[PDB]
Design a binder for this molecule. Structure first.
Ligand SMILES: *[C@@H]1O[C@H](CO)[C@@H](O)[C@H](O)[C@H]1NC(C)=O
Ligand SMILES: CC(=O)N1CCc2c(Cl)cccc21
Length: 357
């Protein structure tokens, strides 16, 4: 099945990196008042040289020129209850990542800009155009995303809520689901020079990116960290407490992209074992006061749009179940329906349900 249909943005000034129109894939579920808007991930680029390389060999992440007319909804975007016990009947939206800016940018391609970085405006424009296609009647809009799209949720969920309020739709409950986008600005295991994208330490690329992208962060977080320090707001544990919308955080304790930016590459000796154990403990610590969270002790990357996302469990509860319990909690804890699920065991795959690879 190829069930989500491409719609390029009617406002063609809201563009991918190369000036081609951004867009969204939609599958409507008439009668459902639930809308799931999913932000794709795929790293970022923070200067002309690394963006030029990404344009040569990762062009779908920078341009809509070659996008297919349809996509299959998978995982949380699947309409089959077997694959998606959580929200199989919802209206499904997949928003391709083609701005390379962690969904933060608001800069057009101009005389002085080779590329447009418009991720924040792409989300706003998708929401606006969807309102005429049924979103006006929604009761819940869940803004979800994986990896850079998960960080995109944290950066944009409150702006979507504010946008709908200002447009006159106060009854739409905006919520966030951030998958694999909760990173730590920690020390690398072995230091690298910030010359490329994947090996550059987390707190550095984002600083350059904000300037290059004209990147924007949530207002309360911006007011805490102030000018020149907005990069702090890309880190879940710092931006999350400033957010008003309900946000459910999904995060592997040993996320492969976290390990990559930390220059960890997997017989593990003492120093690396200690480093990995400390990373899991730090991640666990940052989630202690996040009431809706699912954080399994696995070495892996993303979860929610994978077809077998149903398989992982923490403390006997799957992610689709935890998300359903979260829905119920937003109607004091619920009997047999937990929403805070963080593994405590200290090593990758100490949870037997971890993805096998
Ligand atoms: C198109 O989107 C851009 C970017 O947000 C905005 O400046 C402009 O007002 C929009 N125009 C229309 C007609 O929606
Ligand atoms: C893979 C990816 O997308 N990464 C890794 C590090 C990071 C940060 Cl620190 C913010 C937003 C995205 C990403």
């Amino acid at each position: 099945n190829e069930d989500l249909r491409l719609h390029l943005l009617l406002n063609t000034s809201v563009t991918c990196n190369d000036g081609s129109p951004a867009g969204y894939y939609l599958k409507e579920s008439r009668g459902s008042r639930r809308w799931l808007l999913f932000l794709e991930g795929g790293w970022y680029c923070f200067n002309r040289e690394n963006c030029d390389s990404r344009y040569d060999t990762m062009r779908r992440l920078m341009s809509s020129r070659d996008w297919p007319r349809t996509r299959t909804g998978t995982g949380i975007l699947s309409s089959q209850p077997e694959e998606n016990p959580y929200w199989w009947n919802a209206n499904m939206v997949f928003i391709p990542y083609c701005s390379s800016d962690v969904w933060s940018g608001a800069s057009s391609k101009s005389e002085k800009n080779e590329y447009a970085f418009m991720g924040a405006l792409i989300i706003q424009e998708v929401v606006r155009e969807l309102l005429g296609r049924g979103l006006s009647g929604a009761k819940v809009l869940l803004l979800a995303g994986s990896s850079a799209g998960g960080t995109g949720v944290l950066l944009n969920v409150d702006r979507v809520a504010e946008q709908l309020e200002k447009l006159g739709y106060p009854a739409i409950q905006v919520r966030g689901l951030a998958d694999s986008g909760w990173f730590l600005d920690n020390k690398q295991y072995r230091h690298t020079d910030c010359v490329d994208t994947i090996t550059c330490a987390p707190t550095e690329a984002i600083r350059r990116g904000i300037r290059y992208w004209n990147g924007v962060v949530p207002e309360r977080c911006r007011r805490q960290f102030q000018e020149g320090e907005e990069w702090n707001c890309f880190f879940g544990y710092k931006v999350y407490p400033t957010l008003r919308s309900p946000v459910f955080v999904v995060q592997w304790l040993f996320d492969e992209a976290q390990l990559t930016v930390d220059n960890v590459h997997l017989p593990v000796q003492e120093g690396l074992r200690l480093y990995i154990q400390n990373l899991g403990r730090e991640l666990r610590h940052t989630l202690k006061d996040v009431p809706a969270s699912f954080a399994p002790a696995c070495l892996s990357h993303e979860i929610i749009i994978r077809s077998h996302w149903t398989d992982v469990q923490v403390k006997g509860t799957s992610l689709p179940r935890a998300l359903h319990c979260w829905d119920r909690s937003l109607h004091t804890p619920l009997k047999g329906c937990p929403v805070h699920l963080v593994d405590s065991c200290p090593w990758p795959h100490c949870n037997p349900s971890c993805p096998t690879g």
